[PDB]
Amino acid sequence: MKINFSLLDEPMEVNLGTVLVIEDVSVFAQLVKEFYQYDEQSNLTIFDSKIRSIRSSELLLITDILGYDINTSQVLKLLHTDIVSQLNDKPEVRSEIDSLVSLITDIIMAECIENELDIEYDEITLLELIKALGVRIETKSCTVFEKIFEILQIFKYLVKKRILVFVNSLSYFSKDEIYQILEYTKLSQADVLFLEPRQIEGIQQFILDKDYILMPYNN
């Protein structure tokens, strides 16, 4: 996952988490405007190992952390499927749940037989039980750090998003929280690209000077 712009000499590769610091406010604002307008503008080009350019639908742009909606139909559906798989991995728990659902179905079936009208039903499944329970992620009481962590956790659930990008999101988190975000990103394998006007101390990042020189920085 390499990204390239006219200011860079060679296309820079983005693997796991990547912190890109732009010291020039004009080049940073122009780069962010090229991030929002990416489908319209040909200046900023992001391509994969196949050199194929990714569509704006495949690109995930995030600026406001608390304003973004983490709960979606596809995210909640795939999450319910993941929970159903977790319950399916354990045979004993699945057997007990099947027993309880069998009892409830017996009670409701007796209540249906007591009625005068002829009634028919099918089954009560686990996905229908999770949908009836209303399982969803809670962003209401979550801190910004837990919100970004939940976004990194649900990025694997999003199928269509090729790369996640954050705009000036590193100013809220402490250095230790940034270390936790990067260390978790290395395990999640997702491709995250952060854009900050000022450099963060203690983390590896790519620095772009007002001289338009891109250099790697350990601190």
Binding site: S6, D9, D24, S26, Q30, K210, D211, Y212, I213
Partner: protein, 287 residues
């Protein structure tokens, strides 16, 4: 190169694929090095790379660095422009005072004759007749100082009797600016020839790195004096732009009409060849 590139804006300069890369936040533009003759940096906010400076030294492109006031500060001088320089140093050390005083006297005669031609085009009969008399009265070693008298009468006739070369007015500032640009181009041509620029052809007592380039650039001063005389009422910025228009304008050499850079290069080549061959032919430039 045919092109004088002037960067007055903050930006970054890189060298990519034999191409000068101008990178800025608003736009980026690439200009080939083969078309670029002179590179001028008019501001202190420009950034450059040492690799592009090495490519400019290999391309033999004059790089000028100005100050915050935009006046030129320091220019880049390459150590070895060509291998013929080391062989030309022995010839410069073997030069004779008769050839130096003869070539310098002929050059001063060409400068005074160009001043008389400028006053003749300005329709001054007494001034151009007096400057022509000083041209016919010029002698070796310059005991009468007819060159300095021709300059004093030239500036005093053009700008008025109250005017002087020691004044701080924008007229003398533009004169020193044009003399600095032409001195930079002529000095770069002398660097292309390979001979020592610090050795002058007139006075061996005066020690200056620009002495030789000034002696070669003496006949071309009236071209700057004309635009300075026409734009004298305009502001110093517009006078500087009109001074920059001299590179775009063409002048008529004895052979044909050519650009200023080609006339300076061929003139310096004929001057060096005449110095090494002991006055075979003296190039003459007329307005």
């Amino acid at each position: 190169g045919w092109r004088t590139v002037v960067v007055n804006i903050h930006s970054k300069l890189s060298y990519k694929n034999n191409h000068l890369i101008f990178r800025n936040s608003y736009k980026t533009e690439m200009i080939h090095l083969s078309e670029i003759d002179i590179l001028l940096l008019e501001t202190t906010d420009i950034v450059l790379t040492t690799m592009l400076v090495k490519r400019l030294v290999d391309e033999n492109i004059l790089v000028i660095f100005c100050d915050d006031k935009r006046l030129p500060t320091a220019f880049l001088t390459p150590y070895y422009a060509r291998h013929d320089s080391s062989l030309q140093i022995a010839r410069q050390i073997a030069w004779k005072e008769n050839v130096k005083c003869e070539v310098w006297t002929a050059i001063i005669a060409q400068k005074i004759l160009n001043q008389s031609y400028y006053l003749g085009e300005c329709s001054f009969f007494e001034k151009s007749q007096s400057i022509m008399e000083l041209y016919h009265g010029l002698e070796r070693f310059d005991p009468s100082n007819r060159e300095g008298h021709s300059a004093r009468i030239y500036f005093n006739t053009l700008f008025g009797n109250d005017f002087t070369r020691e004044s701080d007015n924008d007229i003398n500032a533009a004169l020193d600016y044009g003399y600095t640009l032409l001195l930079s181009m002529f000095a770069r041509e002398v660097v292309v020839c390979g001979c020592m620029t610090q050795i002058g052809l007139k006075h061996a007592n005066q020690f200056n790195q620009f002495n030789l380039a000034s002696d070669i650039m003496e006949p071309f001063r009236p071209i700057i004096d004309r635009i300075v005389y026409q734009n004298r009422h305009n502001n110093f910025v517009k006078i500087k732009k009109e001074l920059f228009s001299i590179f775009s304008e063409t002048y008529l050499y004895n052979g044909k009409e050519m650009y200023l850079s080609n006339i300076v290069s061929d003139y310096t080549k004929k001057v060096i060849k005449a110095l090494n061959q002991l006055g075979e032919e003296i190039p003459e430039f007329r307005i």
